[PDB]
Amino acid sequence: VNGVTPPAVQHLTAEVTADSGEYQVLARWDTPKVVKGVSFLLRLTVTADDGSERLVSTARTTETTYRFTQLALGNYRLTVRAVNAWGQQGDPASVSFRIAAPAAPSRIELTPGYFQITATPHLAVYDPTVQFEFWFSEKQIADIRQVETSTRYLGTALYWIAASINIKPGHDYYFYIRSVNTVGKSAFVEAVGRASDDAEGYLDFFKGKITESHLGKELLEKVELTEDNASRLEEFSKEWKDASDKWNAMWAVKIEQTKDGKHYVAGIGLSMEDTEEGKLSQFLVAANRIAFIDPANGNETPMFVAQGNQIFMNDVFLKRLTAPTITSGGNPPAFSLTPDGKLTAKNADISGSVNANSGTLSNVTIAENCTINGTLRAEKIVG
Amino acid sequence: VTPPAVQHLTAEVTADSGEYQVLARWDTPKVVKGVSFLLRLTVTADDGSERLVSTARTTETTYRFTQLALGNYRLTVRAVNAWGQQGDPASVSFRIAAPAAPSRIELTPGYFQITATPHLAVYDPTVQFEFWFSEKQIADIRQVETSTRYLGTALYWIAASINIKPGHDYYFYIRSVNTVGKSAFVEAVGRASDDAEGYLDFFKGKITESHLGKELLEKVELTEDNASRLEEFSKEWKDASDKWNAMWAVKIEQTKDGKHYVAGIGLSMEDTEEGKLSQFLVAANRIAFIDPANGNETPMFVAQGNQIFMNDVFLKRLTAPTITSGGNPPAFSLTPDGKLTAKNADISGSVNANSGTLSNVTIAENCTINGTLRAEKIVG
Amino acid sequence: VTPPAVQHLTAEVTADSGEYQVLARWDTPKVVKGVSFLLRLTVTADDGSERLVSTARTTETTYRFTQLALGNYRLTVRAVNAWGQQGDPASVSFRIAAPAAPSRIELTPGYFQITATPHLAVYDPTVQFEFWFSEKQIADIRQVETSTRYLGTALYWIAASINIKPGHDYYFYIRSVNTVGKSAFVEAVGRASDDAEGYLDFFKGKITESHLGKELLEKVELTEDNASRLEEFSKEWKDASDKWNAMWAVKIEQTKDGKHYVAGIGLSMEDTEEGKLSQFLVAANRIAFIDPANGNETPMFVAQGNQIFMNDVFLKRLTAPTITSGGNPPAFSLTPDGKLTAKNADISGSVNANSGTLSNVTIAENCTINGTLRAEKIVG
């Protein structure tokens, strides 16, 4: 025999890829004669900023190919050996590569809307060749790797405006944004967002949708009865193809009058019109006052009512409310809460604590420990 | 194993097929791959003793008893498995004999309405009531059924309709009605609450005194026990005062067990001093709003018996003489009379108050006093 | 040589036949040349011992003792050979008097039903239960069985009435029954389930299990791509229960890239096991109530899926397990745990508190520390 030491490899190549994200590297080369194998021992180290090394992996194969899987982006150096059956290590070779990626978006801002949400993201420094890729989600995803799968891919711009019928107010939505450009893709920056919440801020929105439809441009905005004094109490069902060449439907009762040189109308209409992506139903009732009742044993008082923007309910169990304003009624409100935060009360019992930044009383009475860690001042004392 | 208990037993009294019949229905907690049920119906003797009448062993969830005469009865069910392990029993006492005379009567006024409710000298849950309304006193009971208003037949009857106005003393003549028959009539002397307003009592009042009100109520046509009627129409007419009256309604009525049943939907504008005033009035026992996107089926808005359910909602200002969170102990709650109730409250500012009732205090800095201090055990 | 004790000694008491009795049953152990059962029944006297009552010798594995009185008893059985050498004894112990009425009663309030499940301290396997429901707590107890709807007699009840509607209390009168007697009565209180989203899937229960659902939803009428059908139909017709079912509806369906979109509302009045029920189903992707008053074009009530949006509103009570002012930092809130949030609390009255933590407090009158003052610094 001869324990001949294995002369080092040449034509050592590293190929960098990003198959499932989390970049890998495929190490490959060629060799002349081998004895009871002649192993290949590999080890791969990243140069830190200052020129010192992290150990990243090792590898004990026999063929002239290998792959390194969970990777971070860093300046990597891969060294390959050649040990023989006895275990006498040949001279090394080494190759160096990088994985340069765009800088993350440093802060992304998230102004609400009406059934919509804007992310406008910004980088720590200005970058001319950066454009961000946005993926939207409704549930905080576990880790910042499976976003490539479990989060819808919105699109890619300098910003995005997610509108739909499904971004619903007071349910937070997490935006996942990664910077992209010619050089690669960064990590995923996460952020939360909302919809505006503001109640009366939704009603104008709805008015706007309503108006731009079959029932808006039929039940109202219809210009018949051109003679003072009439009652064209009308009721039909029309379905037809549109300029988009899709079917649309409405069936209504339109009633309307002319008296004293002025017009009126009231209008129970039901439809389903097309949209770019699907069909939106709708059941729009315009009238000077709406109310319902349970007629049980002679009872005729409506269960609810509403008439030019004031709606009259007996008792409700709400899943959750959310008004900026509350009153006992009257003009000493027995209690109140206002858009500023003030909880106007009368007699305010609390089974728990009151972490208040301050007090402002007359007549106090503590039945156990009264601690003072500040500058206590007093006039007359008898205890 | 024993099959579980008997759930939802009932003690009812039918006379549909020409004579009296006692049905019951029983549903199973969890169903045990071959549940059987013994059920025992027995009578009370003149000495108040127990006599067996009918024992049925069946594997079905309902049964009927036919050719059953007058008297008081007791009905039990047990569950028996294949191996023969009779379970816990569930037993209800019922009666085939009735019409007692109502002992007291309860009267609650209201805006254009007045509640008459029965009180029977002994309770009996196999009974409903006929109500008759009179504007003039009827001395003899014979024309009480003939020369008055047929209010109807039900449980708790409130007087509220077009013929009812504040300030007149109305009368009630009511009796007990069942499968057996009806009793000696009883009277009461009662008055509507004129106008107390609530905040919808004005809207009821507005509603009653309208053409929709007259159409979709107090039209009591089609009165054939266990029959019914539908109409979808639009009757436009010119009124007394030389003006139009438009209207469109969908009205359904039925009659069953002597009692009158109805609902529907109206859209109308009448004539007021200014001119026309449009509408949509629904009356019914449950209304209910649905959104079928994705084939989701859960309402967002369900109202029955003057109450609402609603999922999430938003608002420009609540106006509300009381709130809770719900709970036998409600997590928080403002009272109409100004009291607040909470397990906690963390204010990021200043607590302007009159007084204090604090078992513990922990003031972190300066405490200015301009009055008198009284501290038992003092350190410093 | 010695025969063994009688095993599995089982006693059941009854007085149904006219007055009080005990059935004693057991299983014979293996003996020599025949066997006789000796039974000795004693009652616990005033002294804590047992006064001897009756003694019999028999030869059948079951026996009866008649015309005994009320008390806790020791019944001893022995196995005797032909020679008179009696085996080991087996003495059972079992109790008699008016059974003890539950110590408690627990209500898991279900969505539109109570589940009132009693319990005692010292458990007797051989007492049943009577249950009673009422809407009004009664002054006395002696007229409950004269003034209360009879739920009946089981181990636990679930109580239902169709009109049940959450979030009011209703009062309970339970008792233990057995062969001895109906116990003294017992009180309790309860309500129903409070949550709304629960009701709304509940009501979805009620919605879908109707011919309303079965026509509106559940039927997949139409097929080929770009299908659209609009129809107005009515029927009041015979069903299997010999009832008329009465329904007018509006319905639309459409097919776009295959997927099938329905919407449609309808008044109806179908039949229930108690009476005909008159119920609204509006369904659409979105319903708005909007007003025509003076070129009015803005809503006051927009229900888009699981949400509602509204304007200024007017309630009478509220039960809402969260209310927040909007904004990521809300002006105020109450999450369900009863924690309040705010920035001013001008309770112009007593803060009836359990803790305060007020960094820099002003007092301008009497401070009366019943506990421990504790001050780093004082300049008084």
Numbering used by the authors:
A (entry chain Z): 613 to 995
B (entry chain F), C (entry chain J): 616 to 995
Can you list sentences taken from the study reporting this PDB entry?
Following extensive cryo-EM image processing, both the tail tube and the density of the FNIIIs of gpJ were successfully obtained. These enabled the visualization of the tail tip opening and the deformation of the central tail fiber. Upon LamB binding, the bottom part of gpJ exhibits bending. From bottom side to top side, its cross-section progressively expands from narrow to wide (left). Upon interaction with LamB, the RBD, CSF, and AHS undergo a range of structural rearrangements, from subtle to substantial (right, 3b). The AHS situated above the CSF experiences a dramatic orientation shift of approximately 180° (right) and enfolds back onto the CSF. The upper α-helix (residues 809–840) within the AHS remodels into a shorter α-helix segment, flanked by an extended two-layered β-sheet at the summit of the CSF. The C-terminus of helixes (841–861) in the AHS domains have transformed into two additional β-sheets at the top of the CSF (colored in deep blue). The loosen of AHS helix bundle leads to a reduction in the restraints on the FNIII trimer from the bottom side. The linker between the HDs and FNIIIs disengages and repositions, leading to the alignment of two FNIIIs (gpJ-a and gpJ-b) on one side of the CSF, while the third FNIII (gpJ-c) relocates to the opposite side (right top). Compare to the closed state structure, the distance from the FNIIIs to the remote end of the RBD markedly shrinks from 29.7 nm to 13.2 nm.
